[PDB]
Amino acid sequence: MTQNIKNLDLSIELDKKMYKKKLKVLQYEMLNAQQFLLKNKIGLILVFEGMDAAGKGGAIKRLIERVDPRGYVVHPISAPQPHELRYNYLQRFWRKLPQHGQIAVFDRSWYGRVLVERIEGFATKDEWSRAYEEINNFEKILTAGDYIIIKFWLHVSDEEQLKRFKEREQNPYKSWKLTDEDWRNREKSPQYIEAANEMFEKTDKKNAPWVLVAGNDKKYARVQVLQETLAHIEREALKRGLHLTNVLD
């Protein structure tokens, strides 16, 4: 589970002060990576998926906290509006792609086509069934050009998610947003997990990988999201005959 994703990193868990130092180093490196991508006119597209309260929002917050806000947009993706349904389901995401050298973060994304839309029946069986290759072909158009794509799935246990739901229910900034329907959707988690697993099997590609993040521990998840983003940027840079260096100071 969470232990298996943690057993992929041979490094140890850190106490709080050391976590804070490691986070600060990784955030400086992410800022440097952004300036490198801007200078070399390579776009970056980061996808985040996972159940409610898996920690997508907080992981994103630490990822871009020290990045220049001129160079990124975080898109919180919800259900399509009536105007968006007058086009193909990818249109609303095509519209949001960053320029060469810019960063776009998708907190939920086009993979909704094979997740919530499959689970709730909003997509027919033909639609979600053909969407895996549709999505691979879309991502491959971009990664054959001047874009790097990384997709993150934040795993969380039912138990840890329930703990977080109860925290939110007691939080003045968050209780207003937690509804009875959010609690009822917890009953659909087995089907969501099956759908996510088929998604991994069919759309985990060498140019657009799925990274499974152990989300039960938020501090570990933030560090892992940063490390994996940096590792993949460095490898794709090398594949392009570029070497990531310090371009800040």
Ligand X SMILES: Nc1ncnc2c1ncn2[C@@H]1O[C@H](COP(=O)(O)O)[C@@H](O)[C@H]1O
Which residues are annotated binding-site positions for ADP? Answer: 78-79, 108, 117
- Edge to edge, what strands does the sheet with 147-155 contain? 72-76, 103-107, 43-49, 147-155, 210-214
Instruction: Supply the minimum distance, in Å, between the C-beta of residue 64 and ligand X.
Output: 19
User: Is 244 a residue that touches ligand X (CB under 6 A)?
Assistant: no
Burial of 112 (C-beta count, 10 Å sphere; 0-12/13-18/19+)? buried
248 binds, among Cl ion, ligand X, none (CB under 5 to 8 A by kind): none
101 binds, among Cl ion, ligand X, none (CB under 5 to 8 A by kind): none
- Closer to Cl ion at the Cβ: 91 or 191? 91
88 binds, among ligand X, Cl ion, none (CB under 5 to 8 A by kind): Cl ion
User: Is 91 a residue that touches Cl ion (CB under 5 A)?
Assistant: no
Contact residues for 211 (Cβ-Cβ < 8 A; gap 6+)? 150, 151, 152, 153, 225, 228, 232
User: Is 88 a residue that touches Cl ion (CB under 5 A)?
Assistant: yes
Stretch that binds Cl ion, among 80-88, 136-144, 184-192, 202-210 (CB under 5 A): 80-88
Residue 72 CB neighbours (<10 A): 17
- Closer to ligand X at the Cβ: 7 or 170? 170
Stretch that binds ligand X, among 53-61, 74-82, 136-144, 195-203 (CB under 6 A): 74-82
- Closer to ligand X at the Cβ: 155 or 232? 155
Give the residue from 178, 192, 227, 231 showing the smallest Cα distance to 108.
192
Contact residues for 131 (Cβ-Cβ < 8 A; gap 6+)? 89, 113, 114, 123
What amino acid is encoded at 45 in this protein? I
Residue 135 vs residues 144, 159, 195: alpha-carbon distances, Å: 14, 32, 15
Residues 82-141 that bind ligand X (CB under 6 A): 108, 112, 116-117, 122
Residues 168-197 that bind ligand X (CB under 6 A): 180, 183
**Residue showing the smallest CB distance to ligand X in the complex:** 112
Handedness of CA 90, 92, 98, 99 (dihedral sign): positive
Instruction: Supply the minimum distance, in Å, between the C-beta of residue 108 and ligand X.
Output: 5
Q: What are phi and psi of 100, to 5 degrees?
A: -50, 125
Is residue 213 within 8 Å of residue 221, measured between CB atoms? yes
Stretch that binds Cl ion, among 31-39, 65-73, 87-95, 99-107 (CB under 5 A): 87-95
Task: Map tokens 């794509």 to a residue.
Answer: 149
Binding site for Cl ion (CB under 5 A): 88
Binding site for ligand X (CB under 6 A): 77-80, 108, 112, 116-117, 122, 180, 183
